[PDB]
Design an enzyme around this catalytic site. Structure first.
Site, short mmCIF file in Angstrom:
data_model
loop_
_atom_site.label_atom_id
_atom_site.label_comp_id
_atom_site.label_asym_id
_atom_site.label_seq_id
_atom_site.Cartn_x
_atom_site.Cartn_y
_atom_site.Cartn_z
CB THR A 127 -0.95 0.01 1.21
OG1 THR A 127 -0.18 -0.05 2.42
CG2 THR A 127 -1.77 -1.27 1.26
CB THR A 128 2.11 3.57 -1.74
OG1 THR A 128 3.02 2.50 -1.49
CG2 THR A 128 2.88 4.87 -1.75
#
Lengths: 172, 222, 222, 222, 222, 222, 50, 222
Positions: free
Chosen positions: E1-2
């Site tokens: 995730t980012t």
């Protein structure tokens, strides 16, 4: 004393039985600090406080033995560097609350003082003129035995400020 | 982190650096660690950032709350006591790693001699406190280097300004020998923060003065 | 620590910072981490300082020893192998904390095209090695920041000098985002060390050139 | 324990305190921690008393043994190496608590400039060594206070005698801020021990000189 | 995730990828991680998917609840505080593995200068928060690559659209160097999600715009 | 720490040193460990500084509280009991390391013979107490050396002043053989504190008298 | 005020004693939010509140 | 165990095997794992048999209870939520080994397009849920083989019957590659169970149809 700071820009005056009005004073101080800590200082308003006292008074009267022989006035001014009209609320012993545009008179015989103020009041009167008008209509006195304070809108944070002693004498 | 405090004739000064780390990683380049809790006391807090900012905030609230209820500030002794009780309350969490240590500087208006009404007070994790009487104190990872610097530089302190310069220098040496303490960043223009308390209350030193002192030190060492 | 290495048309360059720490404490301001192991290979080593200097010394001895016995240097492949075997030998101690990782730069004289005879080789703690082919490599605590810097700056590399400037900049960003890596100390005049290898062998970049490049970068960022 | 060493123009000086403890209990009031291992090197050892005295003795034996076999002393580099190998050999026992760290002062007769032929060398528990170049070093529980004292006092060092006074003062501050380091005992007349090495070899400073310097410092601080 | 967020003159933009994993296994190809919590704030949450979606939902409820009771939204400061208190409340479960970290983007209507009324706020697991002032922030496993990309690309940001392109690119590099972050899937037509906040509130960027930007980047790199 | 107490014909004397440590580090050079809890009792407390000062304060409060409610002080027996109950209450924390042991000196006004109305009482960590009848007692890390000194010096005690001198000497020997106990600091002018109780109540010995006695002892030993 | 939002599509007006009708206003606001959170917004209806 | 669910144009189908084991031991040859919780939803549960049957029963009760109180069924969203909350409630026991995972198939009467009103929803042990959009789902020890079978067979699904055949085949491959999943027992005549939901509600597929499909598959593979 019958005049007190409640919060940064919210002041409080009362008339009646000292222990009771004094007790409300304390309750009001209590509510504001906790509320501010939970959310913030600029969130506590004169309106919310005025409301709390009325509800409490009504419930208290209905469930208690003797009604609080008190009359309250909650005052609020704008913050620093902002423009807004001063707000005055009067809370009576039953819980009734009234929004006043110009002035509140509490305790004793209110008719003559209220009328004298009705003739003498002037919006945007300076501090000295409003003091003369208020003392004059109050007489309807001597330098001694007078409790005078202001909610000075020009102060940065804490607006409440007492005017006592020699400075008061010079003003009057 | 490193926060120094030193008395000068007629007042007290308290300065703190700006870095905040996570391990070896520099995470904050402009944290403010010295607060003005009231008109006559400033509080620095070293340690866990959360616990620190919370301590400062809550203590300021409590001082001012009693002041509003009773119509008069506590004596410096009462203030010392309340801060100590807060610190003692965080002890369980400090053993779990959330340790926060405060250094309290104040100017006693009720003291007899105005020239020595300055006050410095230090705390341990267990809430015990000590009134410093050798003229200076520090807290944080750089505290030992800062104290060993002030021990030598302290005979130069004669007024508010010389005391301020000595504070900034002590910070410079803390940062010079410890990596968790940030020095003056000339590139980004970020300098230590400072608070001065004297007979007239507590004021923040404006940044320009700290900038000039830091540049003077840096040129002196080259 | 952080050691970068990058190929440029016609050669290879390898640079390393100067700091050495113990925990948060800065213990060495002028360590040299890049050695010239022979006329065509330089070796950087990150990790435990003892194990590092020992690796470098012993490997240089072994290369030169075989050269004296057989009358011809090993091929670049043999060199890679011996270094790998040393690294594999330190594995037991690396699990105990004495880990040392080498980055090996060389110029293959036997390669077909001289413009791409540069060679960069990276090792893990288990002795496996990999011949880098995207043009650059790094090792140490700042290696990720250095690689992410070179990925963007690498299209600027066109010769020996531009490649050197890119190396110094990558180091500057490593140090900028990691506290265990030292940047150019303008006060004490201590700059990264660099080695250049091309068709004519390996030479140390003289300090002045690195000083000028570092000052150019620092003024560019202000 | 605390042992300081500092170069002065034309030589090196090395001084050490006299206390030896077991926990909080003062067990030895007159231990000698600085030995003259040979005509141009003195060795101080901090740490476990047994391991310390043994190191010193055995190292002196080895230096002199090679000297008798080969007809010429080792170079300062060889001496550094042998000491390092001994230290590396004690590592297993140092993890078990028997740690001993040496600080080696020497005067290189083969150096080019006589005014800077002084040499100070420091070791860690893992045998790595470092040639000090900021002019002074220290080892032991008081080492940080001693170094932070010499950093400020070191501009006063101009000859053998001023360098000696600075050494004694650094020791005084170590003892002043740490309880495991003994200061000058004026009652029993026990003072730090000192060795001076210059072009003419190594000589022990006679006690009277150290007594006068210590009394001068003590009167200066009153 | 980012999840990246960056201010541009006159507003703020916040974008997030779409992948959700369990170990090495790709489990969700179209998760939406950026919510519009209110007319002037968007919230991204990295970490455990359950805790994340719950945080977002409950926070939106609370903001709007106070708004309905008091007739006026909280100030940006109050919002920051409530989010921080929620995050601090999840700390016990975050130590047990259910960690969720929020990144909060908002547009302060009460700020003085409209061109810099954008606001980015980052939180740690312990509820402390920090108002970002270097213009951008990110959270998640790819956050370091995303930040190191935006540091270089950020001088190109001049308006809403260029800021959007920079966001998408930063995501592309995060995914390019980390396997837990999904890039633009050209086959299935799934692209990052984006929210833009300016003087007129918060709107979701329609998918087509993100598709075109992603295709432009992908063709630029070939 | 070390606190001695000894009866003399007609009264009791109680003296305590001034040092407070953290490990090997001297942290307080002027702590006061002997309090006047009431007009006829003084209390010394060895051990954790916080717990110590708290014990003393709270016990004084309780004695005086009962005195105000009932119009008459407790008998010496009741006082002994309350102190014992406090000590027993701290037992759980004393096992956790926060141990504090009190030594209680009092002058019984109700005793039959005035010349032997002096009273010394010692406590253990478990609240049990013992009325000392061999004429003297001590507590703290130096207590054994202090007692072994007073056993020999006690035949010299004939009045208030000789008893005071014997107290100061016992402290001097405690400090002489233990490093956690501070001796008279002639440089800073800090001497042990002393309280004398006789028929007329409890008074603090003024510092000058203790200074002269200490200087007499120190010159006697040279 | 004597007119108020209660929920997304549910409004409220009252006449009498302000503190009391105001108090009901608050109670009604309270019930709807919790109910919606437990089930959903479209589940709270004017009928249930009435 | 293995339970597959797949949408077809105009409806949804959900099938489950019949075996229940304890270790390597086959304990139940005719368990029914797919329930009709209401007129438009069927629920399969994999995992601990007790927890499974209990979940199904209680959820059916709750759906119907709200329906009787409010006079209208919940929306598909509300149903999803309640099931999720139950699943989240069993989390503590699922860590202790009593894990039960539900797969929920429903036909939304309120959806806009009837041909795609089918709904499949999957849950993890932590109560998070996901609305499947690639057309099929499965749960249990054979789920991976079942999904990898349906990925290839799914283009054949064109109506209720072809969708049913694909379901049965997917089950056959699950059982073919995993021993905890039972295949069609031709000897005892026990076949998977199936539920079909479309515009007209949920009906159990009568056994004969499943028998014929299974025999067709088995003869196809011979």
């Amino acid at each position: 004393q019958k005049i007190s700071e409640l919060y940064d820009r919210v002041g409080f005056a009362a008339a009646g039985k000292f222990n009771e009005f004094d007790n409300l004073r304390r309750g009001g101080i209590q509510f504001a600090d906790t509320r501010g800590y939970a959310y913030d200082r600029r969130d506590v308003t004169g309106r919310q406080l005025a409301n709390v006292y009325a509800q409490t008074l009504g419930t208290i009267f209905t469930e208690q033995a003797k009604p609080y022989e008190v009359e309250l006035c909650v005052a609020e001014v704008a913050h620093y560097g902002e423009t807004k009209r001063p707000e005055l609320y009067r809370i009576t012993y039953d819980g009734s609350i009234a929004d006043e545009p110009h002035f509140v008179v509490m305790g004793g015989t209110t008719e003559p003082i209220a009328n004298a103020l009705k003739e003498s009041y002037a919006e945007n009167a300076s501090l000295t003129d409003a003091l003369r008008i208020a003392v004059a209509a109050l007489r309807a006195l001597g330098v001694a035995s007078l409790e005078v304070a202001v909610l000075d809108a020009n102060r940065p944070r804490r607006a409440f400020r007492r005017i006592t002693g020699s400075a008061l004498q010079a003003l009057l | 982190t490193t926060i120094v405090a030193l008395k000068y004739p007629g007042g007290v000064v308290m300065a703190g650096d700006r870095r905040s780390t996570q391990g070896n990683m520099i995470s904050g380049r402009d944290v403010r660690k010295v607060y003005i809790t009231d008109d006559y006391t400033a509080t620095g807090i070293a340690g866990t950032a959360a616990v620190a900012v919370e301590f400062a905030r809550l203590y300021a609230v409590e001082l001012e709350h009693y002041e509003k209820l009773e119509g008069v500030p506590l004596t410096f002794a009462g203030k010392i006591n309340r801060l100590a009780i807060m610190v003692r309350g965080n002890l369980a969490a400090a053993m779990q790693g959330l340790l926060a240590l405060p250094l309290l500087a104040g100017y006693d208006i009720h003291a007899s001699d105005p020239q020595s009404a300055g006050r410095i007070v230090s705390f341990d994790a267990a809430g015990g406190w000590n009134i410093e009487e050798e003229g200076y104190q520090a807290v944080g990872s750089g505290s030992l280097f800062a104290k060993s610097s002030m021990k030598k530089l302290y005979s130069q302190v004669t007024d508010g300004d010389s005391g301020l310069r000595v504070a900034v220098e002590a910070l410079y040496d803390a940062a010079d020998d410890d990596s968790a303490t940030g020095g003056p960043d000339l590139v980004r223009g970020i300098f230590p923060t400072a608070v001065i308390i004297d007979a007239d209350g507590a004021v923040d030193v404006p940044e320009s003065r700290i900038a000039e002192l830091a540049r003077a030190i840096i040129e002196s060492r080259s």
